[PDB]
Design a protein around this ligand. Structure first.
Ligand SMILES: Nc1ncnc2c1ncn2[C@@H]1O[C@H](CSCC[C@H](N)C(=O)O)[C@@H](O)[C@H]1O
Length: 212
């Protein structure tokens, strides 16, 4: 049969450079949330190890239609005909150490938004800089405020700024929220989270259950 080889993909893009070994439960929950929020057609998981095959991708992510590749930023265009050439200046790296905060007018300046697929540590190990130094002529950096976010929070904030055109200063965050389940067990999450319409921090589905 010849009809299922169709390049239907042709009919803002988010790129996560996977920088973890394998897929921990937390990574799977975060990536799942990202897929649900930006859509499988608008997300690329890149830079997976060269030995990566479909059996190495978690079934929770494949079920959501994850588009993934072992190519890095410079090779992605070979793999997806639908991805506009990643070109110098039009690719934004979201970087906690950028000088300039992302603003809605940056929607006119960039076509691709790149994030480290990193489970951040505290203190940060500044691994996102690796990305900036790996592609010195491709990427232009933008910040999302002065506090570390998880990958799914950073993508959610970027979508609020770029698609919904909301200024960074207008986004309601909660910094380092505590989740207490009894008078003796509590967990403070050392990241900045977006607040939902109900005043609660937005976490990936199942994250709360995992923390407890
Ligand atoms: N304040 C901020 N500004 C811009 N991007 C951010 C951000 N906080 C998180 N991100 C995005 O979310 C990703 C995961 S968090 C950063 C990992 C941390 N630097 C460490 O090495 O431990 C980053 O790679 C970045 O792309």
């Amino acid at each position: 049969s010849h009809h299922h080889h169709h390049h239907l993909e042709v009919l803002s893009k988010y790129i996560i450079e996977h920088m973890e070994e394998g897929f921990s439960e937390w990574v799977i929950l975060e990536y799942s949330q990202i897929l649900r929020e930006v859509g499988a057609e608008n997300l690329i998981l890149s830079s997976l190890p060269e030995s990566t095959t479909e059996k190495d991708i978690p079934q929770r992510l494949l079920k959501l239609g994850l588009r993934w590749t072992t190519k890095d930023l410079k090779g992605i265009n070979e793999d997806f005909k639908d991805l506009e050439l990643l070109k110098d200046g039009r690719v934004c790296l979201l970087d906690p150490r950028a000088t300039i905060d992302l603003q809605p007018e940056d929607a006119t300046k960039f076509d691709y938004f790149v994030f480290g697929g990193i489970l951040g540590d505290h203190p940060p190990r500044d691994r996102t800089k690796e990305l900036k130094t790996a592609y010195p002529n491709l990427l232009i950096s933008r910040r999302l405020g002065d506090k570390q976010m998880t990958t799914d929070t950073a993508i959610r904030t970027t979508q609020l700024i770029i698609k919904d055109r909301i200024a960074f200063e207008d986004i309601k965050f909660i910094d380092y929220p505590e989740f207490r389940f009894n008078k003796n067990e509590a967990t403070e999450m050392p990241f900045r989270y977006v607040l939902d319409k109900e005043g609660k921090p937005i976490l990936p589905e199942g994250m709360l259950d995992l923390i407890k």
